[PDB]
């Protein structure tokens, strides 16, 4: 595999999320119902990440989140239709770096970023196995 | 309000959270039912940070999320049982910087960190207000 090929710098993926009463409630704070909560945020993030990249790994390889990180910037409240732009920023080894927007009508509500790591799907069954295994 | 009197540095909560699939799911990709999402520990993150700060503020106030970052170490499996612990990293203007440190049986599973500012409830629900208003 060639990473650098497989994922140009720059290619993206898009969608559109409707703020939900499951996105704001992961605030883990009454207070904080009105509006989307980082963990929608990063979820969403995910997705689109997962979208970019595994379709584009042969047989056998899929993507694993290794470190995300996400800014607040203003609120993305519910009913409301947030934008997720995500982005192959660069590759490094069988790592990923993609770039995070979420904008809506009014603005910017949120920006991030997500390092993925190609894995074998065997070797990742047999990582979970072991580590849960006998002493 | 003196948030450095109110949030000394080192001021922790711990809890534990059981892995199922709905702390899975939210890996957006079937390949990796098994393990806890990195949504799943931002979550847990949150919900800690809010346990920490927020019935330390008076009457009005809140604690709101303006950025997470996350690092996996290693697969919590369905089934695990992940110790989070949340410590006051530092406080400075209206803001506490919050470490995190996800573990199980087996070892550290993730890391984070958290930066939440304090709000006026009143403010707050202005700002959305005022956000989603006319041109
Ligand atoms: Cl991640
Ligand atoms: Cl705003
Ligand atoms: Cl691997
Ligand atoms: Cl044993
Ligand atoms: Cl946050
Ligand atoms: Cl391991
Ligand atoms: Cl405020
Ligand atoms: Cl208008
Ligand atoms: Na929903
Ligand atoms: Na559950």
Redesign the interface.
Same mark, same amino acid.
Do not use: I, K, M
């Given at each position: 595999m060639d990473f650098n090929e497989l994922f140009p710098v720059g290619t993206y993926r898009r969608m559109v999320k409707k703020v939900s009463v499951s996105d704001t409630v %992961? +605030? *883990? =704070?009454k207070? $904080?119902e #009105? /509006?989307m =909560? %980082?963990?929608?945020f $990063? #979820?969403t993030m %995910?997705?689109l990440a !997962?979208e970019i990249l595994?379709h584009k790994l042969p047989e056998g390889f899929? =993507?694993?989140?290794?470190?995300? #990180?996400? @800014? +607040?910037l203003?609120?993305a409240?519910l009913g409301?239709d947030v934008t997720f732009t995500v982005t192959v920023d660069r590759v490094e080894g069988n790592r990923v770096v993609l770039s995070m927007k979420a904008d809506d009508p @009014?603005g910017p509500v949120a920006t991030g970023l997500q390092e993925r790591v190609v894995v074998s799907?065997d070797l $990742? #069954?047999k990582? !979970?196995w072991e *580590? /849960?295994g006998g002493r």
């Open positions: %992961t +605030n *883990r =704070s207070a $904080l #009105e /509006f =909560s %980082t963990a929608a $990063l #979820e %995910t997705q !997962v595994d899929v =993507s694993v989140g290794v470190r995300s #990180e996400v @800014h +607040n203003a609120p409240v409301d @009014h799907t $990742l #069954e990582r !979970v *580590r /849960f």
